[PDB]
Coordinates of C-alpha atoms and ligand atoms in Angstrom, one line a residue:
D3 CA 16.8 63.9 47.9
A4 CA 19.3 62.0 49.7
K5 CA 19.3 60.7 46.1
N6 CA 22.3 62.7 44.7
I7 CA 24.1 60.5 47.2
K8 CA 25.5 57.5 45.3
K9 CA 25.3 54.0 46.8
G10 CA 27.1 50.8 46.2
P11 CA 25.0 47.7 45.3
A12 CA 24.3 44.6 47.2
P13 CA 27.2 42.3 47.9
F14 CA 27.4 39.1 46.1
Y15 CA 28.9 37.6 49.3
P16 CA 27.3 38.9 52.5
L17 CA 29.7 40.1 55.1
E18 CA 30.8 37.0 57.1
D19 CA 31.0 36.7 60.8
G20 CA 34.3 36.5 62.6
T21 CA 37.5 38.5 62.7
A22 CA 39.8 39.1 59.7
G23 CA 42.1 36.4 61.2
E24 CA 39.2 34.0 61.8
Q25 CA 38.1 34.0 58.2
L26 CA 41.6 33.9 56.6
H27 CA 42.3 30.9 58.9
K28 CA 39.0 29.2 57.9
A29 CA 39.5 29.7 54.2
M30 CA 43.2 28.8 54.3
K31 CA 42.5 25.7 56.3
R32 CA 40.2 24.5 53.6
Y33 CA 42.9 24.8 51.0
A34 CA 45.6 23.5 53.2
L35 CA 43.9 20.1 53.1
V36 CA 44.1 19.8 49.3
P37 CA 47.8 18.9 48.8
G38 CA 49.5 20.9 46.1
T39 CA 47.3 24.0 46.1
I40 CA 49.8 26.9 45.5
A41 CA 49.4 30.1 47.6
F42 CA 52.5 32.1 46.6
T43 CA 55.0 31.8 43.8
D44 CA 58.3 33.7 43.7
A45 CA 58.8 34.6 40.1
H46 CA 62.5 35.2 40.7
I47 CA 63.6 31.9 42.3
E48 CA 60.7 30.0 40.8
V49 CA 59.7 28.4 44.2
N50 CA 56.1 27.6 45.2
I51 CA 54.6 27.4 48.6
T52 CA 51.3 25.6 49.3
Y53 CA 48.5 26.6 51.5
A54 CA 49.3 23.6 53.6
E55 CA 52.8 25.1 54.0
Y56 CA 51.4 28.6 54.3
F57 CA 48.6 27.6 56.7
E58 CA 50.7 25.5 58.9
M59 CA 53.6 27.9 59.4
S60 CA 51.3 30.9 59.9
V61 CA 49.4 29.0 62.7
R62 CA 52.6 28.1 64.4
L63 CA 53.8 31.8 64.3
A64 CA 50.4 32.7 65.8
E65 CA 50.7 30.2 68.7
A66 CA 54.4 30.9 69.1
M67 CA 53.6 34.6 69.5
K68 CA 50.7 34.0 71.8
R69 CA 53.0 32.1 74.1
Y70 CA 55.8 34.7 73.9
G71 CA 53.1 37.0 75.4
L72 CA 51.5 39.1 72.7
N73 CA 47.8 39.9 72.9
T74 CA 45.8 42.6 71.2
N75 CA 47.7 45.3 73.2
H76 CA 50.9 44.8 71.2
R77 CA 52.0 45.4 67.6
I78 CA 54.5 43.8 65.4
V79 CA 56.4 45.2 62.4
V80 CA 57.0 43.2 59.2
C81 CA 59.9 44.8 57.4
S82 CA 60.8 43.2 54.1
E83 CA 60.1 43.5 50.4
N84 CA 57.6 41.2 48.7
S85 CA 58.6 37.6 49.5
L86 CA 57.4 34.1 50.2
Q87 CA 57.7 34.8 53.9
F88 CA 55.9 38.2 54.0
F89 CA 52.4 37.1 54.9
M90 CA 53.6 34.5 57.4
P91 CA 54.0 36.9 60.4
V92 CA 51.0 38.9 59.1
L93 CA 48.7 35.9 58.9
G94 CA 50.0 34.6 62.2
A95 CA 49.5 38.0 63.9
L96 CA 45.9 38.4 62.8
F97 CA 45.1 35.0 64.1
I98 CA 46.3 36.3 67.5
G99 CA 44.8 39.8 67.2
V100 CA 48.2 41.5 67.3
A101 CA 48.2 44.6 65.1
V102 CA 50.4 44.5 62.0
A103 CA 52.4 47.6 60.8
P104 CA 54.0 46.6 57.4
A105 CA 57.2 48.6 57.0
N106 CA 58.9 49.6 53.9
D107 CA 61.8 47.3 53.0
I108 CA 63.9 50.3 51.7
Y109 CA 62.4 53.0 53.7
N110 CA 65.7 54.7 54.4
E111 CA 66.7 54.7 58.1
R112 CA 64.9 58.0 58.9
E113 CA 61.5 56.9 57.5
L114 CA 62.0 53.5 59.3
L115 CA 62.1 55.5 62.6
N116 CA 59.0 57.6 61.9
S117 CA 57.0 54.5 60.9
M118 CA 58.0 52.5 64.0
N119 CA 57.7 55.3 66.5
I120 CA 54.0 55.5 65.6
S121 CA 53.6 51.7 65.6
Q122 CA 55.6 51.1 68.9
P123 CA 56.2 47.4 68.1
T124 CA 57.2 44.7 70.5
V125 CA 58.5 42.2 67.9
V126 CA 60.0 43.0 64.5
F127 CA 60.2 40.6 61.6
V128 CA 62.8 41.6 59.1
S129 CA 64.7 40.4 56.0
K130 CA 68.4 39.7 56.2
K131 CA 68.9 42.9 54.2
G132 CA 66.8 44.9 56.5
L133 CA 68.5 43.7 59.7
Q134 CA 71.1 46.4 60.4
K135 CA 68.7 49.2 59.7
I136 CA 66.4 47.8 62.4
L137 CA 69.3 47.2 64.7
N138 CA 70.3 50.8 64.4
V139 CA 66.6 51.8 64.9
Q140 CA 66.3 49.5 67.9
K141 CA 69.0 51.5 69.7
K142 CA 66.7 54.4 69.4
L143 CA 63.4 52.7 70.3
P144 CA 63.3 50.9 73.7
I145 CA 60.0 49.1 73.0
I146 CA 61.5 46.7 70.4
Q147 CA 62.3 43.7 72.5
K148 CA 62.8 40.9 69.9
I149 CA 64.0 40.7 66.3
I150 CA 63.1 37.7 64.1
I151 CA 64.6 37.0 60.7
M152 CA 62.1 36.1 58.0
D153 CA 64.2 34.7 55.1
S154 CA 66.3 32.1 57.0
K155 CA 65.8 28.7 58.4
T156 CA 68.7 28.7 60.8
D157 CA 69.5 31.7 63.1
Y158 CA 71.2 34.6 61.3
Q159 CA 73.7 36.9 63.1
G160 CA 72.6 35.1 66.3
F161 CA 69.2 36.5 65.9
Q162 CA 66.6 33.7 65.4
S163 CA 64.4 32.9 62.4
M164 CA 60.6 32.4 62.4
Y165 CA 61.4 28.7 62.3
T166 CA 63.7 28.3 65.3
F167 CA 61.6 31.0 67.0
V168 CA 58.5 28.9 66.6
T169 CA 60.1 25.7 67.9
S170 CA 61.4 27.7 70.8
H171 CA 57.9 28.6 72.1
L172 CA 55.3 26.1 70.8
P173 CA 54.3 23.7 73.5
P174 CA 55.3 20.1 73.4
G175 CA 52.3 18.6 71.6
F176 CA 51.2 21.5 69.3
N177 CA 48.8 20.7 66.5
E178 CA 48.4 23.1 63.5
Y179 CA 45.0 21.6 62.7
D180 CA 43.5 22.0 66.2
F181 CA 44.6 25.6 66.6
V182 CA 41.7 28.0 66.9
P183 CA 42.2 31.8 66.5
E184 CA 41.2 34.3 69.1
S185 CA 37.7 35.9 69.0
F186 CA 37.9 39.6 69.6
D187 CA 35.9 42.7 68.6
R188 CA 36.7 43.3 65.0
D189 CA 35.6 46.9 65.2
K190 CA 38.0 47.9 68.0
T191 CA 40.9 45.5 67.3
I192 CA 43.4 46.9 64.9
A193 CA 44.5 44.6 62.1
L194 CA 46.8 46.9 60.2
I195 CA 48.8 50.0 60.8
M196 CA 49.6 51.5 57.4
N197 CA 51.7 54.5 56.3
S198 CA 51.2 57.6 54.1
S201 CA 50.7 63.4 51.6
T202 CA 52.1 66.5 53.4
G203 CA 54.4 66.4 56.4
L204 CA 55.5 63.0 57.6
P205 CA 53.7 59.6 57.1
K206 CA 51.0 59.1 59.7
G207 CA 49.9 55.7 61.1
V208 CA 46.5 54.8 59.6
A209 CA 44.8 52.5 62.0
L210 CA 42.5 49.9 60.4
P211 CA 40.5 47.4 62.4
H212 CA 39.6 43.8 61.5
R213 CA 36.2 44.9 60.1
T214 CA 37.8 46.6 57.1
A215 CA 39.5 43.5 56.0
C216 CA 36.3 41.5 56.6
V217 CA 34.5 43.9 54.1
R218 CA 37.5 43.6 51.7
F219 CA 36.9 39.9 51.8
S220 CA 33.4 40.5 50.5
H221 CA 34.8 42.6 47.7
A222 CA 37.5 40.2 46.6
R223 CA 34.9 37.5 45.7
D224 CA 32.4 39.8 44.1
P225 CA 32.1 38.9 40.4
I226 CA 31.4 42.5 39.8
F227 CA 33.8 44.4 42.1
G228 CA 36.4 41.6 42.7
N229 CA 37.1 38.5 40.6
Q230 CA 35.2 35.2 40.4
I231 CA 36.5 32.2 42.4
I232 CA 37.5 29.9 39.5
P233 CA 39.9 27.0 40.2
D234 CA 43.4 27.6 38.9
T235 CA 43.2 31.4 39.0
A236 CA 46.6 33.1 39.3
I237 CA 47.6 36.7 39.7
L238 CA 50.9 38.4 39.0
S239 CA 51.4 41.1 41.6
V240 CA 54.2 43.7 41.4
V241 CA 52.7 46.3 43.7
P242 CA 54.3 46.5 47.2
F243 CA 52.9 44.3 49.9
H244 CA 52.5 47.4 52.2
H245 CA 51.4 50.6 50.6
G246 CA 47.7 49.5 50.4
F247 CA 46.7 47.8 47.2
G248 CA 49.4 45.1 47.6
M249 CA 48.3 44.3 51.2
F250 CA 44.6 43.9 50.7
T251 CA 44.4 42.2 47.4
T252 CA 46.8 39.5 48.6
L253 CA 44.7 38.9 51.8
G254 CA 41.6 38.6 49.6
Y255 CA 43.5 36.4 47.3
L256 CA 44.3 33.9 50.1
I257 CA 40.6 33.9 51.0
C258 CA 39.8 32.8 47.4
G259 CA 42.5 30.1 47.1
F260 CA 44.3 31.8 44.2
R261 CA 47.9 31.4 43.4
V262 CA 49.6 34.7 44.0
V263 CA 52.7 35.1 41.8
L264 CA 54.9 37.8 43.3
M265 CA 57.7 39.8 41.7
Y266 CA 59.9 42.0 43.9
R267 CA 62.1 43.5 41.2
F268 CA 60.5 44.7 37.9
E269 CA 61.9 43.4 34.6
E270 CA 60.1 43.6 31.2
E271 CA 61.0 40.1 29.9
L272 CA 60.7 38.4 33.3
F273 CA 57.3 40.2 33.7
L274 CA 55.9 39.2 30.3
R275 CA 57.2 35.6 30.5
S276 CA 55.6 35.1 33.9
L277 CA 52.3 36.5 32.6
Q278 CA 52.6 33.8 29.9
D279 CA 54.0 30.8 31.7
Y280 CA 52.0 31.1 34.9
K281 CA 48.8 31.5 32.8
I282 CA 48.1 34.7 34.8
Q283 CA 44.5 35.7 34.8
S284 CA 45.1 39.3 36.2
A285 CA 48.1 41.5 36.8
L286 CA 48.6 44.2 39.4
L287 CA 50.6 47.3 38.6
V288 CA 51.7 50.6 40.1
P289 CA 50.9 53.7 38.1
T290 CA 54.2 54.5 36.5
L291 CA 54.5 50.8 35.4
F292 CA 51.4 51.5 33.3
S293 CA 53.1 54.3 31.4
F294 CA 56.1 52.0 31.0
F295 CA 54.0 49.3 29.4
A296 CA 52.5 51.9 27.1
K297 CA 56.1 52.1 25.6
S298 CA 56.6 48.3 25.5
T299 CA 56.9 46.7 22.1
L300 CA 57.5 43.1 23.2
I301 CA 54.1 42.3 24.5
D302 CA 53.1 40.9 21.1
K303 CA 55.7 38.2 21.3
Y304 CA 54.1 36.4 24.3
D305 CA 51.1 34.2 24.7
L306 CA 48.9 36.1 27.1
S307 CA 45.9 34.1 25.8
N308 CA 44.9 33.7 29.4
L309 CA 45.0 37.3 30.6
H310 CA 41.7 38.8 31.6
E311 CA 42.4 41.9 33.7
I312 CA 45.1 44.5 34.4
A313 CA 44.4 46.4 37.6
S314 CA 45.7 49.8 38.9
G315 CA 44.0 49.6 42.3
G316 CA 43.2 52.9 44.0
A317 CA 45.5 54.8 41.7
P318 CA 43.3 56.7 39.2
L319 CA 44.7 56.6 35.7
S320 CA 45.3 59.0 32.9
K321 CA 42.6 58.1 30.3
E322 CA 45.2 58.2 27.5
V323 CA 47.7 55.9 29.4
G324 CA 44.9 53.5 30.3
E325 CA 43.7 53.0 26.7
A326 CA 47.3 52.6 25.5
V327 CA 48.0 49.8 28.0
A328 CA 44.8 48.1 27.2
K329 CA 45.5 48.3 23.5
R330 CA 49.0 46.7 23.7
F331 CA 47.4 43.8 25.7
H332 CA 44.2 43.5 23.6
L333 CA 41.9 44.0 26.6
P334 CA 38.6 45.9 26.5
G335 CA 39.9 48.1 29.3
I336 CA 41.9 48.6 32.4
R337 CA 40.4 48.0 35.8
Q338 CA 41.2 51.2 37.7
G339 CA 39.8 52.4 41.0
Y340 CA 40.1 55.2 43.4
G341 CA 41.1 54.5 47.0
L342 CA 42.9 56.1 49.9
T343 CA 45.2 54.4 52.4
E344 CA 42.8 55.8 54.9
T345 CA 40.1 53.6 53.3
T346 CA 42.1 50.3 53.1
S347 CA 41.1 49.3 49.6
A348 CA 39.4 51.1 46.7
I349 CA 35.9 52.3 47.2
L350 CA 35.4 53.2 43.6
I351 CA 36.3 50.3 41.2
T352 CA 35.4 49.8 37.6
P353 CA 32.9 46.9 37.6
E354 CA 33.2 43.9 35.3
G355 CA 32.1 44.6 31.7
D356 CA 30.5 47.9 32.5
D357 CA 33.6 50.0 31.5
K358 CA 33.0 53.6 30.6
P359 CA 35.7 55.7 29.0
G360 CA 37.5 57.8 31.5
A361 CA 35.7 56.7 34.7
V362 CA 37.4 55.2 37.7
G363 CA 34.2 53.3 38.4
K364 CA 31.2 53.0 40.7
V365 CA 30.8 52.8 44.4
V366 CA 31.8 49.5 46.1
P367 CA 29.1 47.6 48.0
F368 CA 28.8 48.7 51.7
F369 CA 29.7 52.2 50.7
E370 CA 28.2 55.6 49.9
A371 CA 30.1 58.3 48.0
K372 CA 28.9 61.8 47.2
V373 CA 30.1 65.2 46.0
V374 CA 29.9 68.4 48.1
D375 CA 30.2 72.0 47.1
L376 CA 33.6 73.3 48.3
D377 CA 32.1 76.4 50.0
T378 CA 28.6 75.8 51.2
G379 CA 29.3 72.1 52.0
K380 CA 25.9 71.1 50.5
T381 CA 25.9 67.9 48.5
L382 CA 25.7 68.4 44.8
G383 CA 23.8 66.6 42.0
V384 CA 24.4 64.9 38.7
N385 CA 27.5 66.0 36.6
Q386 CA 28.6 68.7 39.0
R387 CA 32.2 68.9 40.3
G388 CA 32.6 68.9 44.1
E389 CA 34.7 67.4 46.8
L390 CA 34.4 63.6 46.9
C391 CA 33.1 62.2 50.3
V392 CA 32.8 58.5 51.3
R393 CA 31.2 56.7 54.2
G394 CA 31.5 52.9 54.7
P395 CA 32.9 50.1 56.8
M396 CA 36.4 50.2 55.4
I397 CA 37.2 53.7 56.5
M398 CA 40.2 54.0 58.8
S399 CA 39.5 54.1 62.5
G400 CA 42.0 57.0 62.8
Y401 CA 45.6 58.2 62.6
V402 CA 47.5 56.7 65.5
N403 CA 48.4 59.3 68.2
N404 CA 46.7 62.0 66.2
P405 CA 42.9 62.6 66.7
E406 CA 43.5 66.1 65.6
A407 CA 44.1 64.8 62.1
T408 CA 41.6 61.9 62.3
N409 CA 39.0 64.6 63.0
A410 CA 38.5 67.2 60.2
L411 CA 39.4 64.5 57.8
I412 CA 36.3 62.5 59.0
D413 CA 33.2 64.5 59.9
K414 CA 31.3 63.0 62.7
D415 CA 28.6 61.8 60.4
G416 CA 31.2 59.3 59.4
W417 CA 32.2 60.9 56.1
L418 CA 35.8 61.0 55.0
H419 CA 36.5 64.2 52.9
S420 CA 38.9 63.2 50.2
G421 CA 40.3 66.6 49.3
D422 CA 40.1 65.3 45.7
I423 CA 37.4 66.6 43.2
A424 CA 35.1 64.4 41.2
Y425 CA 31.7 64.1 39.5
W426 CA 29.4 61.3 38.6
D427 CA 27.2 60.2 35.6
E428 CA 23.6 59.6 34.9
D429 CA 24.7 56.0 35.0
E430 CA 26.6 56.5 38.3
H431 CA 30.2 56.3 37.1
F432 CA 32.6 58.5 38.9
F433 CA 35.4 60.7 37.4
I434 CA 38.4 62.2 39.1
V435 CA 39.8 65.6 38.2
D436 CA 43.6 66.1 38.3
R437 CA 46.0 69.0 38.7
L438 CA 47.5 67.9 35.4
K439 CA 44.8 69.1 33.0
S440 CA 43.4 72.2 34.8
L441 CA 44.5 75.0 32.5
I442 CA 45.5 78.6 33.0
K443 CA 43.7 81.0 30.6
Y444 CA 45.9 84.0 30.0
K445 CA 45.1 85.8 26.7
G446 CA 42.7 82.9 26.1
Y447 CA 45.1 80.1 25.4
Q448 CA 46.2 78.0 28.3
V449 CA 49.3 76.2 29.5
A450 CA 49.3 73.1 31.6
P451 CA 50.8 73.8 35.0
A452 CA 52.9 70.6 34.7
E453 CA 54.7 72.2 31.8
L454 CA 55.7 75.2 33.9
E455 CA 56.5 73.0 36.9
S456 CA 58.9 70.9 34.8
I457 CA 60.7 74.2 34.0
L458 CA 60.9 75.3 37.6
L459 CA 62.1 71.9 38.9
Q460 CA 64.8 72.1 36.2
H461 CA 66.5 75.0 38.1
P462 CA 69.2 73.8 40.5
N463 CA 68.1 76.0 43.4
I464 CA 64.3 75.2 43.1
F465 CA 63.7 72.0 45.2
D466 CA 59.9 71.8 44.5
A467 CA 57.3 74.0 42.7
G468 CA 53.6 74.1 42.3
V469 CA 51.9 76.1 39.5
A470 CA 48.4 77.4 39.7
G471 CA 46.4 80.3 38.2
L472 CA 46.5 83.6 40.1
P473 CA 43.0 85.0 39.4
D474 CA 43.2 88.6 38.2
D475 CA 40.3 90.6 36.9
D476 CA 41.9 92.2 33.8
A477 CA 43.9 89.2 32.5
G478 CA 41.7 86.2 33.2
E479 CA 44.4 84.2 34.9
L480 CA 48.0 85.1 35.4
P481 CA 50.1 81.8 35.9
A482 CA 51.8 81.8 39.3
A483 CA 53.8 79.3 41.4
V484 CA 54.6 78.3 44.9
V485 CA 58.3 77.5 45.1
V486 CA 60.4 75.6 47.7
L487 CA 64.1 76.5 47.6
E488 CA 66.9 73.9 48.0
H489 CA 68.4 73.9 51.4
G490 CA 71.6 75.9 50.8
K491 CA 70.2 78.3 48.2
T492 CA 68.6 81.7 48.0
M493 CA 66.6 83.3 45.2
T494 CA 64.2 86.2 44.4
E495 CA 60.8 86.2 42.9
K496 CA 61.9 88.2 39.8
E497 CA 65.1 86.1 39.4
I498 CA 62.7 83.2 39.1
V499 CA 60.2 84.7 36.6
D500 CA 63.1 86.1 34.5
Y501 CA 64.2 82.5 34.3
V502 CA 60.8 81.2 33.2
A503 CA 60.3 84.1 30.8
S504 CA 63.3 82.8 28.8
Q505 CA 61.9 79.3 28.2
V506 CA 58.2 79.9 27.4
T507 CA 56.1 81.4 24.6
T508 CA 55.1 84.7 26.3
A509 CA 51.6 83.8 27.3
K510 CA 53.0 81.0 29.3
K511 CA 55.2 83.5 31.4
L512 CA 55.0 83.5 35.2
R513 CA 53.3 86.9 35.4
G514 CA 51.6 85.8 38.6
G515 CA 54.8 85.7 40.5
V516 CA 56.2 83.3 43.1
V517 CA 55.4 82.7 46.8
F518 CA 58.1 80.9 48.7
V519 CA 56.6 78.0 50.8
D520 CA 58.2 75.3 53.0
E521 CA 56.3 72.7 51.0
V522 CA 53.9 72.6 48.1
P523 CA 50.5 71.4 49.3
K524 CA 49.8 67.8 48.4
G525 CA 46.4 66.1 48.6
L526 CA 46.3 62.8 50.4
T527 CA 47.1 60.7 47.3
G528 CA 50.2 62.9 46.9
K529 CA 48.8 64.7 43.9
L530 CA 49.3 68.5 44.0
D531 CA 46.4 70.3 45.5
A532 CA 45.2 72.9 43.0
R533 CA 43.5 75.0 45.6
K534 CA 45.6 75.8 48.7
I535 CA 48.2 76.7 46.0
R536 CA 45.8 79.1 44.3
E537 CA 44.6 79.8 47.8
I538 CA 48.2 80.5 49.0
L539 CA 49.0 83.1 46.2
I540 CA 45.8 85.0 46.6
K541 CA 46.9 86.6 49.9
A542 CA 50.6 87.1 49.2
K543 CA 49.3 89.4 46.4
Ligands
7V6_1 B1 46.2 53.5 48.0 C1 45.3 52.3 47.6 C2 44.3 51.8 48.4 C3 43.6 50.7 48.1 C4 43.7 50.0 46.9 C5 42.8 48.8 46.6 O1 43.1 47.8 47.5 C6 42.8 48.2 45.2 C7 41.7 47.1 45.1 C8 41.6 46.4 43.7 C9 41.5 47.1 42.5 C10 41.4 46.4 41.3 C11 41.3 45.1 41.3 O2 41.1 44.3 40.1 C12 41.3 44.4 42.5 C13 41.1 42.8 42.5 O3 41.8 42.1 41.7 O4 40.2 42.3 43.1 C14 41.4 45.0 43.7 C15 44.7 50.5 46.0 C16 45.5 51.6 46.4

């Protein structure tokens, strides 16, 4: 009974041959030749850019980079916040086979270093506002030869724009419509180097195959959205941290108009939803809970709105139903995905929504639950660790096969670290830190309630509450604590403090264990074991 191992259906679109760059180029060239087809729309400055514009300039950046000298043994960095120019160097680079590491616009200067030491990039594309931060970081990274400014047409601080850079390297008679992109092995050639849990962000290497699969999902009437003319999307989610990246690529495959918003604003948001006739909106999790509090939605004509998507962020069932009610939608489309799996591999399918589920397994994939101790795969309705195997899994963490391994067993399964179960109808469900309850006496306090108290203390930098299992009491509630840098404290001084703000059953009878860091779990969510694990010895 390899039969409690859950399997994604058949694709509507078969996987297509070619690299990620070869199929983007082929799709975009189709839409380039229809004048007026809009690719991106900047909701802030109201400017539109057509596929003809988008195709042509991307191609030129590909042949201008090829000439400069970049082959698949080089990487570039794109450092900018969501913009009309963002996917120009990305598209151009994939056409070449150069690996793209999107960097985080307002990563502070330290996290800009950690990202770029892993990605070791020859050329860096950057927005005017990102420039000095990358200048500073270039004087600490010798590999960064060239800096190109994305949001200019002229040069800017003597530095060169994509536009003058391209005319500085394209050969005399270059022809955007005779360009052909490189063929290369899509399994070994890295398309994207993404970022990320505990410690410092790693570099998740993802080869062209994962985007090629993604391109099969995006069109899927069940797991993506149907190629209808005049489809538009309002995307707020960042063009890096996952979601934003691979929906937009799939959206360019489909010919959709991607309406981007880089700064969030309620009225701007809702009006763009209305005016652009948006079919589906993309949101980050805490923009869902915001929209649960919105009372203006009713004043806008969202007659056209079909879907609101949360991506690979699993949603509180209460927040999801709230958002969907304020917009008069049957449901939210939530899914579960890891950066280490490119896109989501659990997605709620069209129509088949089921209250509280993230969804079912995407085509090309297998997902299963495994018992946390024996490792044996479990059956229907049992909670275990969620494990997934399929083409979109990360190739590895750059410069870190010690982490790549033991995250992926060499039967090709990624072990999520997150806990789940599935239905007799094959829906999956994710279990969160946030409603695992600590039974002392026999009534239970949420660990988030006790964490909120602990984080309130000026000398407690981070906390993590879990239930110390003791034989007499049932569960004594305990915490792992991280002290602020200057400060010093004592276990009892900490529980004295809690036991002054909680009922008396909610008191921190389990004690505190001082840790350098509270264990997170891949999607950043607090890991309920390890914490429980950590306290069990210290007692
Ligand atoms: B960390 C992370 C990793 C991956 C992702 C996925 O790319 C989301 C994919 C998705 C979800 C819902 C949709 O409706 C659509 C779509 O519009 O096709 C697409 C999100 C976060």
